Design a protein around this ligand. Structure first.
Ligand SMILES: *[C@@H]1[C@H](O)[C@@H](O)[C@H](CO)[C@H]1OS(=O)(=O)O
Length: 500
């Protein structure tokens, strides 16, 4: 064993957590929609063709906001193609994913699905092949009550009450040479500025996300964000950032350190926002939408065998293992550590596509390994993120020095009189004996200690069996104003405290 200490001080706060950091994302990609949320033949389909089993699995994650309809897809998409009578909806070539899109689901049916899972929708506008006229028309269609052509058209399409969508994305990551209608930072900043203005003139209640770089390795990384914000600052509310991780080298110790990079990356994008704030002399603070994050790598070879121009190909179907769940847990803790400036985040994506929920045609829906830490973070991670002051043993890996074995944060919920400690032990060999100073939480007791662990980091779940599942046999105990807990080697831990 090794020892680590953490102070849990009520009055050393980061910020209230915005629940939208537990968001997700559904794109018209692979089986996320067709065979994912929507499967008319299925024994568990509802009156509208939505799979009830998927609905219950999303509800259990308590996802507050879902980005839709893309993603790379949106940059070539015409929103009118997906509304009104099905017979008039055209079949399209989706150039993003080289698929035929039938438009059998469009925005009004997605809104119906979102209402059944209790999520708001973070709606994206196309700024690839389209521009400012389509952006104002879509906001009017969705949000204007009545008495104009596009509002009355929504009513005629069967949706009397406006959708009242709060948060919109200005395009999708347009910086990449593989994007439909790629734009330079100046071209994107200009069209995003002019789109943002007309959107807000239709509905001043909305807020806007301007798109950051596709990834931190782009040649234009950081330059992009600074230029785009220079063009848009007065008209927008968030800047996005995106990250995927993978373990292509089978190096568990280096893999689990990657959240340290995520931490730096968030601090960098915050710095850019605050540079442009100062350059503008603005009183407004721009926050971050971490609107794509996950592990993604396992399905890369399988995707190469998919022929173009099929309907609902099985793209991006990673099957996650236990170490992947540990890294997801470290990523969630990293989001909470930045609750002051990361207000929205989207686990990319929610069903089938690099997803915590997987489905089988005419068959079961099941929870991936990564479902569990996400569920725990969403369910028990509402409240105020506290500033951690930690003394942990550390290790070096290929790409990282001084990696703490302990990754942890506490979240205080004053209304529930609860404190939740999220902790990963990265150690591949030894348990960590965690001692938490809880002097500032008088009359708190341990409620529970949840552990996600498995002897085999490569073990996956499947429709037939779930060997990687949480248990409640964690030994956390409160004695003399100190919580002592054994964190097993390679484990995710949720130590819940409450006033009793
Ligand atoms: C990020 C995009 O917005 C998505 O369409 C996609 C899958 O989540 C990601 O882009 S990438 O070009 O696949 O990395």
């Amino acid at each position: 064993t090794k020892k680590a200490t953490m102070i849990i001080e009520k009055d050393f706060k980061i910020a209230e957590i915005d629940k939208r950091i537990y968001g997700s994302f559904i794109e018209h990609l692979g089986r996320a929609v067709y065979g994912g949320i929507y499967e008319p033949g299925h024994p568990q389909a509802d009156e509208n063709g939505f799979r009830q089993d998927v609905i219950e699995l999303v509800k259990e994650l308590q996802v507050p906001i879902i980005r839709y309809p893309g993603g790379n897809f949106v940059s070539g998409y015409n929103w009118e193609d997906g509304v009104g009578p099905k017979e008039q909806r055209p079949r399209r070539l989706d150039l993003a994913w080289k698929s035929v899109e039938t438009n059998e689901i469009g925005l009004n049916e997605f809104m119906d699905w979102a209402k059944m899972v209790g999520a708001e929708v973070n709606m994206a506008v196309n700024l690839g092949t389209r521009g400012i006229d389509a952006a104002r028309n879509l906001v009017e269609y969705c949000n204007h009550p009545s008495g104009s052509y596009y509002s009355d058209l929504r009513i005629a399409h069967g949706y009397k009450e406006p959708h009242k969508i709060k948060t919109w994305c200005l395009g999708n990551e347009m910086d990449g040479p593989w994007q439909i209608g790629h734009k330079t930072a100046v071209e994107y900043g200009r069209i995003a500025c002019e789109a943002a203005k007309v959107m807000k003139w239709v509905d001043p209640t909305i807020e806007l996300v301007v798109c950051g770089s596709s990834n931190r390795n782009m040649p234009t990384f950081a330059e992009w964000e600074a230029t785009v914000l220079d063009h848009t600052y007065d008209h927008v509310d968030y800047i996005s950032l995106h990250q995927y991780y993978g373990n292509r080298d089978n190096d568990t110790a280096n893999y689990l350190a990657l959240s340290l990079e995520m931490d730096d990356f968030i601090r960098s994008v915050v710095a850019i926002a605050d540079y442009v704030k100062a350059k503008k002399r603005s009183k407004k603070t721009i926050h971050l939408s971490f609107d794509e994050w996950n592990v993604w790598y396992h399905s890369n070879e399988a995707d190469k065998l998919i022929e173009p121009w099929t309907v609902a190909p099985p793209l991006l179907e990673d099957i996650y293992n236990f170490e992947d769940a540990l890294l997801v847990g470290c990523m969630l803790i990293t989001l909470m550590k930045h609750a002051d400036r990361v207000k929205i985040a989207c686990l990319a994506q929610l069903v089938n596509v690099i997803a915590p929920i997987m489905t089988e045609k005419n068959g079961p829906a099941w929870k991936q390994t990564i479902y569990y830490p996400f569920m725990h973070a969403s369910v028990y991670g509402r409240g105020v993120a506290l500033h951690p002051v930690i003394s942990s043993p550390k290790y070096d890996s290929k790409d990282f020095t001084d990696v703490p074995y302990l990754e942890s944060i506490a979240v205080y919920n004053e209304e529930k009189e609860e404190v939740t400690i999220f902790a990963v032990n990265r150690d591949m060999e030894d348990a960590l004996l965690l001692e938490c100073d809880v002097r500032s939480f008088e009359d708190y007791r341990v409620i529970e200690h949840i552990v996600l662990e498995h002897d085999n980091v490569k073990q996956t779940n499947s429709a037939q069996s779930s060997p990687v599942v949480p248990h409640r046999n964690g030994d956390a105990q409160l004695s003399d104003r100190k919580v002592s807990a054994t964190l097993p080697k390679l484990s995710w831990n949720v130590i819940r405290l409450g006033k009793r």
